[PDB]
Design a protein around this ligand. Sequence first.
Ligand SMILES: Nc1ncnc2c1ncn2[C@@H]1O[C@H](COP(=O)(O)OP(=O)(O)NP(=O)(O)O)[C@@H](O)[C@H]1O
Ligand SMILES: [Mg+2]
Lengths: 572, 588
Amino acid sequence: GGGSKTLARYLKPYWIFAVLAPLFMVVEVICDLSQPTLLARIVDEGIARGDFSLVLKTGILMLIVALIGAVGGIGCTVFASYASQNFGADLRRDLFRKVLSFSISNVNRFHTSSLITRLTNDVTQLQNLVMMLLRIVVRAPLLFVGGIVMAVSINVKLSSVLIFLIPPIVLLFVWLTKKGNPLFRKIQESTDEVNRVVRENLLGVRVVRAFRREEYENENFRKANESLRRSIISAFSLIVFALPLFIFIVNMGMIAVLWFGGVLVRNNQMEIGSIMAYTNYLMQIMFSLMMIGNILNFIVRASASAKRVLEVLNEKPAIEEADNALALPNVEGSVSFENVEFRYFENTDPVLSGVNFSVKPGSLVAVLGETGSGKSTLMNLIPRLIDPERGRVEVDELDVRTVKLKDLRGHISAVPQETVLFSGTIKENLKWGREDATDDEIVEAAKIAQIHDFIISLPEGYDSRVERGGRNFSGGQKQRLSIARALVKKPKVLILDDCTSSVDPITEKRILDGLKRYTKGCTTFIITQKIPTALLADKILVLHEGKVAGFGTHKELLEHCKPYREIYESQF
Amino acid sequence: GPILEKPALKNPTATLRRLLGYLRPHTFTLIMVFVFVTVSSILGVLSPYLIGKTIDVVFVPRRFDLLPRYMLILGTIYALTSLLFWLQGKIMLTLSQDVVFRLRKELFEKLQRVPVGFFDRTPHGDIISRVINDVDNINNVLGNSIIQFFSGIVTLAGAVIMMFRVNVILSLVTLSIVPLTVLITQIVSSQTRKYFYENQRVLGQLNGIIEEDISGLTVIKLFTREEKEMEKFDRVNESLRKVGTKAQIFSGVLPPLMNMVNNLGFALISGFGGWLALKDIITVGTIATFIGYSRQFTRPLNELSNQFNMIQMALASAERIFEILDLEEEKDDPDAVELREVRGEIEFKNVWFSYDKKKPVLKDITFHIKPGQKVALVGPTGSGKTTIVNLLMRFYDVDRGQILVDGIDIRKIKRSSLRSSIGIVLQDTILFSTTVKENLKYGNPGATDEEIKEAAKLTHSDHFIKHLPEGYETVLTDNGEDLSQGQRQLLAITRAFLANPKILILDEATSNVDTKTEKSIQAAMWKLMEGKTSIIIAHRLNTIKNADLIIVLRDGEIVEMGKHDELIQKRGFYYELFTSQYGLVVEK
Ligand SMILES: Nc1ncnc2c1ncn2[C@@H]1O[C@H](COP(=O)(O)OP(=O)(O)NP(=O)(O)O)[C@@H](O)[C@H]1O
Ligand SMILES: [Mg+2]
């Protein structure tokens, strides 16, 4: 049914803050509704009756209410700040803790880009929404309702003028929202389009230039440039017509008050001061009503962040360690697949099917095949990142689903096809597999990884700074850096998924040769689409169209595997 | 949000004179708006007067025969106040947009005249955001900000001269709150800035931890880092909690405080207005008038302070845009081409180049190609086989030596003719989000849809193109993301084929193709290379064999040349590269 998780639980712990925030608001709104009445009191009971004490005392009394109102509005903002902040903190924490537990099949649902936004932006929106609920969401409506209340108390008959002023204002708001909404979205289409032309022109500039097509690209840009100008005038012309028309209605409101109020005073029903206090209340009711409008526009958008965040808090991890999972104090390096079949989504046919093969501890196997054969998928099964839809995967004749994930994952060591490093020092990155690893031990790994000399040339060296992304290092040394990181772990199984793409062929050969002597008693997979790299391994597993085509040696495979010959022909 | 530091600009008056140069063509319209803003801003200071006077003439003296005349004077004055707001509002709307529309036009046409170099030096994302931000930033000011600054200043002075003519003491009492405003506003504005930034700091860190850990989640799990990573998030998060509060507090106390001075004003005007009224010094309706000014100093003052800060900020933006519009364009010499009808012969003579003038990339490269001969550039990355394509396409100019085609210096030949006589496929060409037909037409505009079918048929593209949804008119959104890279390389080749350049330099990746397409690719290559000079990059085992000439580069120098058989038997570095790559023959 989706999930019963709710984000109201993150505010509860701070309810006290949530209740004082709006309580302090009323104290302000009252002190704000009080002012205009005390003014009518000065003129209709102080000036008209000529007693200075009245004016003097209610003047002093108006000052006190201004200050108390001040302590009000502040105490609100202060307390709502606390509530909304801890809200985001708590929300953000759980939200982060969820994502960390996600299998890759989970990240598959929410694309990785959306995950980021839900944990960064959406969290702030909600933080604001909670801030908003505790200040103006209390303010405006209380000024609106309290304002109307005061007017009615001052003179019921005159209040009928409200019944005429409110509907047209409300109607204006509705009309704008329903005519402007699609015209603002229309602007958003025209703006983005301008970017598509500016991005593509920067991207393929050499293409454009080389083809002498710049003239065509200006004509192509002008089209988007005009659309933007056009789409904006339309939308914003409505806006620039609304504001003035709003001010007019509230102004005519005044008219209606001085005119209709004028007769009431003539008929000796309504004092002159009460007329002054009415004109103020009249405005408070209106402007509040405008704020109420803006609130509604924000709420709907805010609601979308609630849904996205809730989806994440309601997603369940697709890989779970069983209750009595087996502890693996060691592993030998046996790796087997029994009738393994795998799809990423239900709609597509199998990415892997009828996968049967085994490997003895210490082996050095090369997994070879053209793009889209399932090589990476296949390898991602060993460390339980994904689970087989059909069949099982074993490590040391044990079903991986049966053993502790920290143990299993601890003994496996992969070098992912897309390299990623984290903020800090190079040495910190290299120790990700072993915290107690000695410096010499790291130099060993980095030397094998053909990267120790690059590091040693850095002004800071091993304590050199890794950018947040690992963006400062290119593909080569980033790639090599992780091989070093991979080896420092001291794995009993070592997966290398295209970990040479970004280095020179001369450097590559050295690393692999260094492995042979350093991967002593370590089962090793060399995933690659090239026969040259496959030949360095003792045996070659060949995948084609998601199935295992042949498992053996160049000689055997050349005669038996049509996919191998097909690959052979493509490269020679 | 809170500006970090006041922007450092250089001769803003000049950039102002220059920016105002875009305003000169529509001057009459501007004056009109300015007077509109003027009359309307005055009309609004008059309102609280009349109302107060209506209390003095109609209400108090009790003569309501006069009521309809005053209430008619408003119904007309108000009507105009908003009639003008709508005018000064819309008048600018088309004006402002018409200005930036020009700035955009100029900036874009500038983007295609400006040397490729600038695109390579700084990332695409940040040069676009910085430019579009300045362009928007100038839109705000030029369209809205400026007039509201002028409006508010006429309003401010107006209401003030008015107040003083009506009454001095009461005026001095109301303006008493001004110092309060300015002082409070300034103290709260420094804290709001301090913590805004302090919070922005801690937030950016926390945020970074989130972006990287989600993007590299797989690695994080592979290394069992959850506990460690959670703690990393925690310590930061718990400090965002504590700072984000302070940031959230100060940014939100100004409105209550500004309100407070608004009520302190109401009270004063009431307690002294009503006490001067009781001395017959002032009239009651006058109080109503002054009340209607008691909110004219708090916020409207700040809006003046902030609108000023937004205008400076906008100048800086303008200054940037102007400098970009002043970047020197690529221009051909008066005596360059056109290239005579030739088969195309290339030649390098002691050519020295380097993107970074400091570090050399090529060095004394000198060779000679013959019309029709396939050539192969081989070497380990860090050589210069890549930096060759650029120089030959004159994306950059050689620093030493010279290059020529058909015996004419590349720098003394119109880039227009050069680009038309030379073709180019790269390991990273770029398709445009359009119909495949349109993409393939990008080379030879005017080519019929029947000629393109045959042409695309000779390069093994026709098969999978019809096999697409919506055939040739298929839209390749997001630059061909919905295609296999192999199929793209094919399309890129088919495109390059239609430009039919006498000289054809190409770099065909082979890293992520299926064997099937792979054959289609190399087949299309040979049918693309025939009939013309081609300078290929070395990834194909079968092209460095048929190469009429192989030229091995290393550390930006030409170490060896000659045919394959010659180079392998020479025991040369070529042999080393080849045997350390195709030393698979040990199996056979
Ligand atoms: N995360 C994913 N979600 C959905 N489908 C995927 C994912 N990863 C891969 N695929 C698809 O599954 C098939 C096999 O994937 P994969 O194992 O990554 O290919 P591969 O053999 O490693 N190719 P290459 O990476 O070019 O050597 C391909 O058709 C992919 O399109
Ligand atoms: Mg792969």
